[PDB]
Amino acid sequence: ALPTPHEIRNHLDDYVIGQEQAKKVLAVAVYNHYKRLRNGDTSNGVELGKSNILLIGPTGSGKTLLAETLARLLDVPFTMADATTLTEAGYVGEDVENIIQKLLQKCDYDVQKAQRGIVYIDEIDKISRRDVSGEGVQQALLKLIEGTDTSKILFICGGAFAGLDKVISHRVEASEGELLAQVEPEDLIKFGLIPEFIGRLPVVATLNELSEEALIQILKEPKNALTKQYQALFNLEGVDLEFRDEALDAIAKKAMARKTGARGLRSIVEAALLDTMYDLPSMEDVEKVVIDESVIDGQSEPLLIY
Amino acid sequence: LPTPHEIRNHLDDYVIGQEQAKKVLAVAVYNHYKRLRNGDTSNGVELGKSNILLIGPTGSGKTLLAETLARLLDVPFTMADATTLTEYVGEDVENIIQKLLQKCDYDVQKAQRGIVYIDEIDKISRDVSGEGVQQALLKLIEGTDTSKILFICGGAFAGLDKVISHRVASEGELLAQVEPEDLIKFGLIPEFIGRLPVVATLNELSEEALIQILKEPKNALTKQYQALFNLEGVDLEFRDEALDAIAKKAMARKTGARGLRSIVEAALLDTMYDLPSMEDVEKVVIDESVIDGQSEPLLIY
Amino acid sequence: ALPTPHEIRNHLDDYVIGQEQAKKVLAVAVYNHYKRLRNGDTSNGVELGKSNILLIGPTGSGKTLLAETLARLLDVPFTMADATTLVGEDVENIIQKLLQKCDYDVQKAQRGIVYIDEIDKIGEGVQQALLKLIEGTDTSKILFICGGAFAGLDKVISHRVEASEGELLAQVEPEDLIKFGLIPEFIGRLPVVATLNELSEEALIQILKEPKNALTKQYQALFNLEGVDLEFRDEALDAIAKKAMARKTGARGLRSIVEAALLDTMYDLPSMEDVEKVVIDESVIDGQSEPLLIY
Amino acid sequence: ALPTPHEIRNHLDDYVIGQEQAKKVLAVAVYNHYKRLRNGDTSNGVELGKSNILLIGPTGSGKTLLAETLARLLDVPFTMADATTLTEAGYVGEDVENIIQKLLQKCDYDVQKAQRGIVYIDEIDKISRKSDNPRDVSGEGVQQALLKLIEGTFLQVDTSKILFICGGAFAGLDKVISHRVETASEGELLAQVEPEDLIKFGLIPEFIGRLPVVATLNELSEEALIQILKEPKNALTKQYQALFNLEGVDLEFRDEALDAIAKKAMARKTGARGLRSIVEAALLDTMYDLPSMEDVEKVVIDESVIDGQSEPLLIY
Amino acid sequence: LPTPHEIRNHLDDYVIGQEQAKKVLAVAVYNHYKRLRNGDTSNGVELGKSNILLIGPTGSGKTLLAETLARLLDVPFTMADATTLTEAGYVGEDVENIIQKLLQKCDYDVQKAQRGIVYIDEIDKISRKDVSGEGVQQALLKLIEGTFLQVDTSKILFICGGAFAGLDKVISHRVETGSASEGELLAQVEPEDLIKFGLIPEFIGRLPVVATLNELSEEALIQILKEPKNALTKQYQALFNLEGVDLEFRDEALDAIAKKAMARKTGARGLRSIVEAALLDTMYDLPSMEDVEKVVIDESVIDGQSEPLLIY
Amino acid sequence: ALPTPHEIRNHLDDYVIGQEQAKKVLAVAVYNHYKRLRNGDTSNGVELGKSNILLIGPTGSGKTLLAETLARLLDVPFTMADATTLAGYVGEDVENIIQKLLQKCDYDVQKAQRGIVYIDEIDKISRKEGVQQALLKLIEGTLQVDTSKILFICGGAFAGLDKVISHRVEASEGELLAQVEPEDLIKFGLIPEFIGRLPVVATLNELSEEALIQILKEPKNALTKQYQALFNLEGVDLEFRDEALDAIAKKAMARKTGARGLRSIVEAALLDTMYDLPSMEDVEKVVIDESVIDGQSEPLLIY
């Protein structure tokens, strides 16, 4: 029994904050897609158009988080992929199908459930035209969107599109949130995306403010997360670095107030652990624990356990 | 083989207006396949390959025509963009061929009967990198075989309407006076234009054109959303005032036929969001729900 | 076995009409270039001079065609390049392109020919950058052929020699190109200078008939596989020539005229059942009356 | 045995004056860098992030001296390079690896020690492609070229192990920061510095991300400059006192004169750099007719520095 | 060691005017060699090497001052043009060429080669205001510090000459106040000004001693033709001398020669090319006559229509 | 006994035509140069300034001929050198010009110092470079032979020179090249330190019919040698009569194209011959005047 767009959006409120309009578009785009799979590709003599999605929002806005939750709420296999690891290769054409084998991997090799799966491509704005090779993916990955079958699987392309806020202004001529609503297929064309690619992404969603939980994940989940990197730098000191949740959240908030987004996470953490790293090799303690009082107030020093 | 008349008649079911352009495409396509069957050489004389160059605004139907031509002739069809090649791309030029074989079941013969449509040709017009493609992709036109495959190059040619005037009414009347030398000054090399003998010109679609595009085509937008609403147990009815409203919205945005979908989605957005959570008979879309996207669609229980 | 300038020019008469002087020059220049490659750069203690070619003629005179034809008649790799496009590291791009069509064979690529279009357009940096190639750093073996219209060249020559443009282009000198905009070190790398005349009214008519690939023969063969005989009257062929000159398109604009004159006919041709179709003058110049239809 | 950040900072106090915050940052950055090379790129299943440095401070604030000192204090091969020498050439991306051969040169061609070396690129702010102070296409190419080094790629030496320190005045950076933080002094503003501020300045996102650690330098104050003329083992006063010393004459710099030299330096904004050019023009006349006299000592008062009207006192 | 006074004094015999410049050079030169003899380190303190940067119009006496200094200290002297260095990496090995030429004029004596002087002309030319041009500033920089001759350039004194046409402007854009002559503007020169001109900081820091020359005036030019031990008039009076003919230059004729030199803006460099065009006809048919002396008047210089006076 | 400037100019009239002003300058310069070597570098307490020469004129004006002639008229060793063929290893190739001067001097150090050196195409190394200073080392003077004594003469066309002078002086090229100044050569691409070494400057205005004849024969890259080798690989021997070569010179002077317009003349006269050459079977082809001037008659064909 498929969840109505009302239900889909409802459970999305539990994992992501704000972004109500985008969550309305995704709820509809997702519903229609699976509502088309169950019934069939052809419906009453008419062929239904595949409605793939394009997420446009700043880094750490929750683009990745949204694509993940949609899969969990529909108990459907989910896999990620970076468009940057695809650029500059003709052999990556055999690496574009790699994203498919990973889908089957987390799908127990079930062909049918795999076709119901969702694929999220991060940083699509990066491949927009090296220019020839970068585009090579736009057209290589393009073969997937159609389906050779990848026709059934839903595609979600996320991107920050920094320069997108400028091209739209040169055409529509409020705030970035107001300008990103005026987005058009021709706007992405001037950005660096090919017409045949954009035509495959009918559904276009836009995010506004950053997501506290999104940023918090960027400081933890990634294999190269700041916290992980520092924990390892403190580790070769014979010192265990622990980040308390309150602290992480504190950090995210600071990054939003400064509108620096994920890009400004390090500058914060660095000033937070600056004093500690300086006089750390001059002490003898088991671990250092970072609290919220240390991050927000910047008043109290990080705790120390001997 | 279907006569040029038949080809033009089947194109009337998928594309609207552009009658002159479809007359040229019908003859060019007919002569091309008429040549392949007979042979490259005919009665001691060598026949000239007649490739096509579509020149029309964005959303005029340049791409649709191409796709339709292939379907009406049960011939493999592949698309490609010129901006993709500009600036190691010589080995990416042959990529368009492997894609043609992919949709051709790897049959060498049927692949030669295939049609290739390169979009945004006007973009590569120089700068050394753009020209390098006009000469690299040029190696395909002749054939090295890519000699048998039909090439259809499409483009908007924004600055073309200006150079023609500097040499020679409306843009449609000015695009009829187009000459090989006009594309030269535009940015295309002599050797390239000479490979594109046939030149078709498309006009700027009006209101009634867009309206029929939303209705007539077997894959019309309305038919699609009606089918989507249909598997919900609901009937979708687009009032005439509503469809004309969509067309106008499209014209105001200059997006042509391509902007049609983005318009239809916005209007039906709220509706499809709370459709499966109701229990009615049919939904009626009117002009008040499109032009301003203000009032909600009509719900009959 | 190298083809004599006689033979070379003779096979040029099969692809290009007129320009008999241009083709006599290209023949000797090309013959001597490869004759030097086979024998060697140094010959009998004397170092032979590399003879590169400079093609000067109106747009659509046959410059590009002459270059291409030279390559085919010598089974030698050929590659074009636009001087307007030119970038120092892009000058070597013309080379890799020559290797692409040469199957990456170093020896056959050195036997190759390169045509640089619109040299009159260039700026100076290119004249000196592309200069490094002419010498060779190897690009010493490859034959270079620089084409150009040189609109203002007809004037500078007149301000010195003080007939027709054909007569003046024959008085062309290295110093004339100097005043034009070319550097002394660049022109000195192009010893051979070939001039092409303007395809006249009679020349254009011949281009429509004489060539093995003339337009009339191409359309007569197209109408031929339809069971129809296509006939072009002389008054009609002259009409097309006049249409091309008024447009200053030259021979490049010949096809565009014939196509528009045979558009309506080819459209409703497979729908008829006649013996032959005759193209008269009224159908070309006027474009009002339809071609004659004999059943 | 690696020196602690305390130790490193401590020894930096023996060559560079003030900039305490900047030295604390450099001390941690440098420590971490070599603490990583010894342990290994990967540590306990986690990959350590390379911590290159970006020096932001006015001309003659101590950027060059700090870089050089760090290397001496760690017996490590040091080499410099101007970012201005990279622009205007297409093959200059090969002149970038030239900085590597110069590293091996001062390192005795030892592959291992060379990887432990430190590189300092001056005037990075000058290669930024922006509308501020209007070649952009060639300048940006450098940021992306030198970039390949930061990551790491016939020396065979990998540039992944060598520490990079990119210095630059960043004149207009004071401004862009103020157009963001708005709702104090430049020192207070350069503390508010953010990777996005440099972006608007003219640096590409891929380059800034390679420079995680950012150390800022304040404008050497009066008292700072005065100390520079006295305290340093090779201070100007101690140099001129040495030149006058081998003439049988004692040179005395009244504090009134030293602060006067500082002010002259501040007004010109030349920082510590413009120090020697001031002292020379003051002592030019005296040193000309010095070997032609016979007195005990020459006393330099303020009136010789500021006014430059009066001549130094001569004690017979 | 000659005192700065002596050094400047003997410079007066070779160069006219530029008294301030010679004062700067004298002091710098004195200190440099005063340093070499004593040693790099003196009394626990390291002395600062004081290299020179000459700044003045073309033909003001830059090159002459450099050369003269060497003769006044019997020291090996060699020139070089900064333009010969620009646009080359192989010129990094041509930078060391300047040293081998010094050793050449020094009989391959490593010590006396280290005491030598090197004058680099047209430094203002290599100012990137680029990559190849700057490549010299940093390459030639390596020398100024000091590094198979085995000679160290640390000891050798460097003198970088140049016109710096644009420097005149940048100095006015700084010293200006709200809303004098170039001589007065060139005195205000500061290390920061050269920075904006196109010289790298690390290079200017190696040229502490900065000297400035003024533009030679009429009376100045007039003296250059007479006073210098190798003045032109003295050279030609010797050429005519070995012909048994006395050459006399009227004051009115010398002043005329000065004016011609200014109108052409060639400074002192353009003097010779003026004297030669006047005495050309006369030197031609001189070994074919038999007179006592020749007298060059103004009418022969300015007008160039009338021939020199011949006395029998 | 040294020849007076009068005598020197008179014997130059026998080998070169026109260029009377230049020859007057060369006569004085050379006279004084050798008048200084005999007397001594220092004279009556005053050091005499070395007067090196800079020939400025069109290609084939007689720059090279004048130089050679001066040496013969003074029985003095003469050697040429191209500035083009002149790198860091070429710094040791610059001294090569010296060993060549000793070779033709029987390795006599004294007579070698009395020798004359002519450097061709100086206008070709002007940066607009390292050779200017590498060769500069010679002009001053450093085999053990000092180059301080040898007289230097640097010839060059200086194509762009005509322009730079016009942008300052603001007649014919002959009147413009008379206004030449040391600063003009500066902007052209010559370094100050080099121009200062060439005090005596001589300009030329007329082409030499004989000089052009030489260019067609003497040079290792002469047109005749280039075409004779082209005909040679055809099994044919190309012969240029003296009256045909001269015929070429005049044609080139009538068009004022100098030596740059010698190729386009020789081609137009051997164009027909080269066309139907690979289609014959003869021994040699003789080019006569009628073949050049008249252009009517074809070259003689010996079977």
From Swiss-Prot, chain A:
GO cellular component, one term: endopeptidase Clp complex
Keywords from the UniProt entry: ATP-binding, Chaperone, Host-virus interaction, Metal-binding, Nucleotide-binding, Stress response, Zinc
Chain sites annotated for binding ATP: 58-65
Keyword Nucleotide-binding: yes
Mutant lacking the gene: phenotype: Delayed and decreased induction of the extracytoplasmic-stress response.
Induction: By heat shock. Part of the clpP-clpX operon, clpX can be expressed individually from its own promoter.
Record-level GO BP terms: cell division; protein denaturation; protein unfolding; proteolysis involved in protein catabolic process
UniProt entry tagged with the keyword Nucleotide-binding: yes
Cofactor binding note from Swiss-Prot or TrEMBL: Binds 1 Zn(2+) ion per subunit.
Single GO term (MF): ATP hydrolysis activity
Cofactor(s) recorded in Swiss-Prot or TrEMBL: Zn(2+)
Domain of life, source organism: Bacteria
Function (record text): ATP-dependent specificity component of the Clp protease. Uses cycles of ATP binding and hydrolysis to unfold proteins and translocate them to the ClpP protease. It directs the protease to specific substrates both with and without the help of adapter proteins such as SspB. Participates in the final steps of RseA-sigma-E degradation, liberating sigma-E to induce the extracytoplasmic-stress response. It may bind to the lambda O substrate protein and present it to the ClpP protease in a form that can be recognized and readily hydrolyzed by ClpP.
Family label: Belongs to the ClpX chaperone family.
Quaternary structure and partners: Component of the ClpX-ClpP complex. Forms a hexameric ring that, in the presence of ATP, binds to fourteen ClpP subunits assembled into a disk-like structure with a central cavity, resembling the structure of eukaryotic proteasomes. Interacts with Mu phage DDE-recombinase A; this interaction remodels the viral transpososome for replication.
Record protein name field: ATP-dependent Clp protease ATP-binding subunit ClpX
Origin species: Escherichia coli (strain K12)
Shown residues within the full chain: 63 to 413 of 424
Swiss-Prot record, chain E:
Gene that encodes it: clpX
KO phenotype (gene knockout): Delayed and decreased induction of the extracytoplasmic-stress response.
Cofactor note (record): Binds 1 Zn(2+) ion per subunit.
Protein residues bound to ATP: 57-64
Keywords: ATP-binding, Chaperone, Host-virus interaction, Metal-binding, Nucleotide-binding, Stress response, Zinc
Quaternary assembly: Component of the ClpX-ClpP complex. Forms a hexameric ring that, in the presence of ATP, binds to fourteen ClpP subunits assembled into a disk-like structure with a central cavity, resembling the structure of eukaryotic proteasomes. Interacts with Mu phage DDE-recombinase A; this interaction remodels the viral transpososome for replication.
One example GO MF annotation: ATP-dependent protein folding chaperone
Protein name listed in UniProt: ATP-dependent Clp protease ATP-binding subunit ClpX
Cofactor(s) this protein cannot do without: Zn(2+)
Highest taxon in the source lineage: Bacteria
Assigned GO CC terms: cytosol; endopeptidase Clp complex; HslUV protease complex
Entry similarity comment: Belongs to the ClpX chaperone family.
Organism annotation: Escherichia coli (strain K12)
GO annotation, biological process: cell division; protein denaturation; protein unfolding; proteolysis involved in protein catabolic process
Function per UniProt: ATP-dependent specificity component of the Clp protease. Uses cycles of ATP binding and hydrolysis to unfold proteins and translocate them to the ClpP protease. It directs the protease to specific substrates both with and without the help of adapter proteins such as SspB. Participates in the final steps of RseA-sigma-E degradation, liberating sigma-E to induce the extracytoplasmic-stress response. It may bind to the lambda O substrate protein and present it to the ClpP protease in a form that can be recognized and readily hydrolyzed by ClpP.
Annotated signal peptide: none
Swiss-Prot/TrEMBL induction comment: By heat shock. Part of the clpP-clpX operon, clpX can be expressed individually from its own promoter.
From Swiss-Prot, chain F:
Cofactor(s) required for function per UniProt: Zn(2+)
Annotated knockout phenotype: Delayed and decreased induction of the extracytoplasmic-stress response.
Induction, as annotated: By heat shock. Part of the clpP-clpX operon, clpX can be expressed individually from its own promoter.
Cofactor note: Binds 1 Zn(2+) ion per subunit.
Claim: Nucleotide-binding is one of the keywords in the record: yes
GO cellular component, as recorded: cytosol; endopeptidase Clp complex; HslUV protease complex
Superkingdom of origin organism: Bacteria
GO molecular function annotations of the record: ATP binding; ATP hydrolysis activity; ATP-dependent peptidase activity; ATP-dependent protein folding chaperone; disordered domain specific binding; identical protein binding; protease binding; protein dimerization activity
Signal peptide: none
Keywords recorded for this protein, A-Z: ATP-binding, Chaperone, Host-virus interaction, Metal-binding, Nucleotide-binding, Stress response, Zinc
Binding residue positions for ATP: 58-65
GO biological process: cell division; protein denaturation; protein unfolding; proteolysis involved in protein catabolic process
Assembly with partners or alone: Component of the ClpX-ClpP complex. Forms a hexameric ring that, in the presence of ATP, binds to fourteen ClpP subunits assembled into a disk-like structure with a central cavity, resembling the structure of eukaryotic proteasomes. Interacts with Mu phage DDE-recombinase A; this interaction remodels the viral transpososome for replication.
Family per similarity comment: Belongs to the ClpX chaperone family.
Summary of the function given for this chain in its UniProt record: ATP-dependent specificity component of the Clp protease. Uses cycles of ATP binding and hydrolysis to unfold proteins and translocate them to the ClpP protease. It directs the protease to specific substrates both with and without the help of adapter proteins such as SspB. Participates in the final steps of RseA-sigma-E degradation, liberating sigma-E to induce the extracytoplasmic-stress response. It may bind to the lambda O substrate protein and present it to the ClpP protease in a form that can be recognized and readily hydrolyzed by ClpP.
Gene name for this UniProt entry: clpX
